Structures are given as C-alpha cells and as structure tokens.
Subunit: 25 residues, 5 copies
C-alpha cells in the first residue's frame, strides 16, 4: 500500500530528528 | 487507524523541531 | 477527521522550520 | 480538499529544508 | 494522484534530513 510507506517514512523522519538532536546536544 | 498514526508521528516531529529550535536559540 | 489535525501539525512544522531558517540566518 | 494542502505544506517543508541545507553548506 | 506526490515529498524530506545528519557529523 501507500499509507504504510507514509507511516514508515514519518518514522524515519522521527529517527533522523532524534539523531539531529543527539548531534546538536 | 492510519490517520491516527500519522497525527502522532507529526506530533513527535513537532516536539523534536521545538527541541531543535531551543537548542539553536 | 484527522486530516485537520494533520494540516495543523504540518503548519506548525512549517512555522518551526521557518524559525530554524531565521535562527541559522542570524 | 485537504490532500492538496497537505501536498503544498510538504512542498514548502522541502523548500525550507533545502534552505537549511544551503545555509549550512 | 496526490498520495504519490506525498510519498515523493516525504522521501525527499528523508533524503534531506539524511544530508543534514551527514553534514552535522
Ligand atoms: C517538484 C520537483 C519535480 C518532481 C515532480 C514529482 C515527480 C514524481 O511524482 C509524480 C507523482 O505523480
Ligand atoms: C538529497 C541530497 C541533498 C544534498 C544537498 C546538496 C545541495 C547542493 O546544491 C547546492 C547548490 O547551490 C550552489 C551553492 O552556491
């Protein structure tokens, strides 16, 4: 489907923002 | 529910972006 | 419907990204 | 429709991320 | 079709965030 990929990409975005916060701190 | 999943991930994204804003400022 | 909440959160995200742009500018 | 606004906001998010990348480069 | 555009923009956002992480590291 496509909503599954949308959710997975949003999860990847959450992970990448977590990593960005880690690197900023 | 898909839509519900998307709202929660976007809320996490908003929280992380607020954290990034306050880490920059 | 959750589409309204999705649009609200995306609008907040746009605002926060503009804030980040301005913070990186000066 | 709300899908058009979602696409528009995502496109603006892409533009803002491009601006962030350009500023960081 | 708007879902294809949404997935495309989300994938581009993921790529840009990966670039931001790779630039911060
Ligand atoms: C905005 C940059 C040009 C790329 C256009 C999107 C191509 C892929 O999406 C097509 C959806 O149908
Ligand atoms: C998903 C790949 C994103 C990596 C960012 C590369 C952007 C480099 O192009 C910038 C061109 O602007 C010229 C600078 O002056």
């Amino acid at each position: 489907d496509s909503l599954k990929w949308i959710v997975f990409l949003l999860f990847l975005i959450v992970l990448l923002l977590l990593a960005i916060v880690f690197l900023l701190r």
